[PDB]
Design a protein around this ligand. Structure first.
Ligand SMILES: NC(=O)c1ccc[n+]([C@@H]2O[C@H](COP(=O)([O-])OP(=O)(O)OC[C@H]3O[C@@H](n4cnc5c(N)ncnc54)[C@H](OP(=O)(O)O)[C@@H]3O)[C@@H](O)[C@H]2O)c1
Ligand SMILES: COc1c(Br)c(Br)c(Br)c(Br)c1Cn1c(=O)ccn(CC(=O)O)c1=O
Length: 316
């Protein structure tokens, strides 16, 4: 049973959730079932993961078997930037909701701030592999997403991969109806996000930490890239508590009041990753982990740096 972080809407978002990026069909259903059995209530999904239909099946199973009630689940999905045009926001959301077999989403996020070429080519690219932009902006998207909230199809909106400049742009938009309840960004001891977390919290916006284990399975990983799970200094703190490195990496965020969404399809690891409420990292250990900051991104998306709303050029 995970604790919660209170949102500005007073909704309670479970502080540990299950990630589903790259969770294969044929394993993601069982993964979600095991997670719910283990006490997970928060599941992080996305249209672009192309597995929401199988996540939906798992959720429906557990509900109809009395393992969990819908009101106790916390389901998050994301709008992909090829769908920022108003009519496409609705169509994309409807596909997400139908796949998940749900009547509503708890949170719906703008997945990335830069608009891409509109349509169902999810990764429109040139010959070099650079993203092709679209003229519809995240503000255009937000307008259409606000309708879903008006209609009760989504309880709250949020953003992902936004810098403080972009969040400012959103918050300071004249005629804003709903405010973002979270900003989901990469966060871990190599990218501690101190300034961005400080900013978000000061605006009543929570932070959701993605790739908390450093996303070791990411396709573009090079053998020289830093590895959090094998970091001797992380492992030292784990050993001190007779816990795993993964558990330390997860507990790190909990103690900063930051939501964290580790991904696994491995039953043992799914359980392991939520066994993080029976120990505490000391003040000194937290400081030590914070000192590991390298401003290193596993998810740099250099292929889109040429587009207007590239979030990672700013300091925070
Ligand atoms: N908003 C965004 O733009 C964005 C970007 C990236 C990710 N996300 C979200 O955040 C979630 C988590 O990030 P991520 O998937 O990039 O990477 P991650 O959770 O940091 O790492 C996942 C990898 O670590 C392995 N693993 C999981 N638990 C482990 C453990 N206890 N010990 C050792 N290895 C373990 C998994 O293997 P197995 O699965 O084989 O067990 C998987 O290969 C994603 O699934 C997605 O939901 C969002
Ligand atoms: C595979 O490399 C690319 C390329 Br090329 C482009 Br263009 C984009 Br956009 C992305 Br987001 C990626 C990476 N990527 C995916 O493809 C799918 C999901 N994610 C994570 C997320 O946003 O949740 C990626 O980073």
């Amino acid at each position: 049973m995970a604790t919660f972080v209170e949102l500005s809407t007073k909704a309670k978002m479970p502080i540990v959730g299950l990630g589903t990026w790259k969770s294969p069909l044929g394993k993601v259903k069982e993964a979600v079932k095991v997670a719910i059995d283990a006490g997970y209530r928060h599941i992080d999904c996305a249209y672009v993961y192309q597995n929401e239909h199988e996540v939906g099946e798992a959720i429906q199973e557990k509900i109809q078997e009395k393992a969990v009630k819908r009101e106790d689940l916390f389901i998050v999905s994301k709008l992909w930037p090829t769908f920022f045009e108003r009519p496409l926001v609705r169509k994309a959301f409807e596909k997400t909701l139908k796949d998940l077999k749900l009547s509503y989403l708890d949170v719906y996020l703008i997945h990335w701030p830069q608009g891409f070429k509109s349509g169902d080519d999810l990764f429109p690219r040139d010959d070099k592999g650079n993203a092709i932009g679209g003229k519809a902006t995240f503000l255009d998207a937000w307008e259409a997403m606000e309708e879903l909230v008006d209609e009760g199809l989504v309880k709250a909106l949020g953003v992902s991969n936004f810098s403080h400049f972009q969040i400012e742009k959103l918050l300071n938009k004249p005629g804003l109806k709903y405010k973002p309840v979270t900003n989901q960004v990469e966060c871990h001891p190599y990218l501690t996000q101190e300034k961005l977390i400080q900013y978000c919290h000061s605006k009543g916006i929570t932070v959701t930490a993605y790739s908390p284990l450093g996303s070791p399975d990411r396709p573009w990983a090079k053998p020289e890239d830093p590895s959090l799970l094998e970091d001797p200094k992380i492992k030292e703190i784990a050993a001190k508590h007779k816990k795993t490195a993964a558990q330390v990496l997860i507990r790190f965020h909990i103690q900063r009041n930051v939501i964290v969404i580790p991904k696994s399809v491995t039953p043992a690891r799914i359980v392991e990753n939520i066994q993080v409420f029976d120990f505490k990292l000391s003040d000194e250990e937290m400081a030590t982990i914070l000192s590991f900051n390298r401003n290193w991104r596993a998810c740099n998306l250099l292929q889109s740096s040429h587009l207007e709303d590239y979030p990672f050029n700013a300091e925070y």
